[PDB]
From Swiss-Prot, chain A:
Subunit of the fusion protein that is processed upon entry into the host cell. Mediates fusion of the virion and cellular membranes by functioning as a class I viral fusion protein. Contains a viral fusion peptide that is unmasked after S2 cleavage. This cleavage can occur at the cell membrane by host TMPRSS2 or during endocytosis by host CSTL. In either case, this triggers an extensive and irreversible conformational change that leads to fusion of the viral envelope with the cellular cytoplasmic membrane, releasing viral genomic RNA into the host cell cytoplasm. It comes from Severe acute respiratory syndrome coronavirus 2 (2019-nCoV). Residues 1-48 are annotated as: Heptad repeat 1. Changing D28N: In strain: Delta/B.1.617.2, Mu/B.1.621. The chain holds residues 923 to 971 of 1273 of the full protein. It comes from the Viruses. This is Spike protein S2'.
Swiss-Prot record, chain B:
The chain holds residues 535 to 583 of 1273 of the full protein. It comes from Severe acute respiratory syndrome coronavirus 2 (2019-nCoV). Changing A36D: In strain: Alpha/B.1.1.7. It comes from the Viruses. Changing T13K: In strain: Omicron/BA.1. Attaches the virion to the cell membrane by interacting with host receptor, initiating the infection. The major receptor is host ACE2. When S2/S2' has been cleaved, binding to the receptor triggers direct fusion at the cell membrane. When S2/S2' has not been cleaved, binding to the receptor results in internalization of the virus by endocytosis using host TFRC and GRM2 and leading to fusion of the virion membrane with the host endosomal membrane. Alternatively, may use NRP1/NRP2 and integrin as entry receptors. This is Spike protein S1. The lineage of its organism: Viruses, Riboviria, Orthornavirae, Pisuviricota, Pisoniviricetes. Binds to host ACE2. RBD also interacts with the N-linked glycan on 'Asn-90' of ACE2. Cleavage of S generates a polybasic C-terminal sequence on S1 that binds to host Neuropilin-1 (NRP1) and Neuropilin-2 (NRP2) receptors. Interacts with host integrin alpha-5/beta-1 (ITGA5:ITGB1) and with ACE2 in complex with integrin alpha-5/beta-1 (ITGA5:ITGB1). May interact via cytoplasmic c-terminus with M protein. May interact (via N-terminus) with host bilirubin and biliverdin, thereby preventing antibody binding to the SARS-CoV-2 spike NTD via an allosteric mechanism.
Length: 49, 49
């Protein structure tokens, strides 16, 4: 049971070292807030007539 | 330069601090614009810098 836990934690390190998209839920929050601040800046370019 | 002023370059009035830029304007350009569609660099009309 100890060797299985130690081996299963080894796969957490290997996974987080290997695959880029693991934290997709958190990066998508940072992306949404940054996209909103960038859209709000670009809207200063609008003439509105 | 390096002080806050009410500038006016060729009718481009604004409030800002002027600074010596490394932005390489090609000969035909006089104003450079930011993502917000506002001027963030200008060629001085007496000293061509």
């Amino acid at each position: 049971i100890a060797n299985q836990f130690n081996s299963a934690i080894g796969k957490i390190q290997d996974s987080l070292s290997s695959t880029a998209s693991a934290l997709g839920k958190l990066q998508d929050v940072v992306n949404q807030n940054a996209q909103a601040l960038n859209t709000l800046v670009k809207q200063l370019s609008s003439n509105f007539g | 330069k390096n002080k806050c002023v009410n500038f006016n370059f060729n009718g481009l009035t604004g409030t800002g601090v002027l600074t010596e830029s490394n932005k390489k304007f090609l000969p035909f350009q006089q104003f450079g614009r930011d993502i917000a569609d506002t001027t963030d660099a200008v060629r001085d009309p007496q000293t061509l810098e």
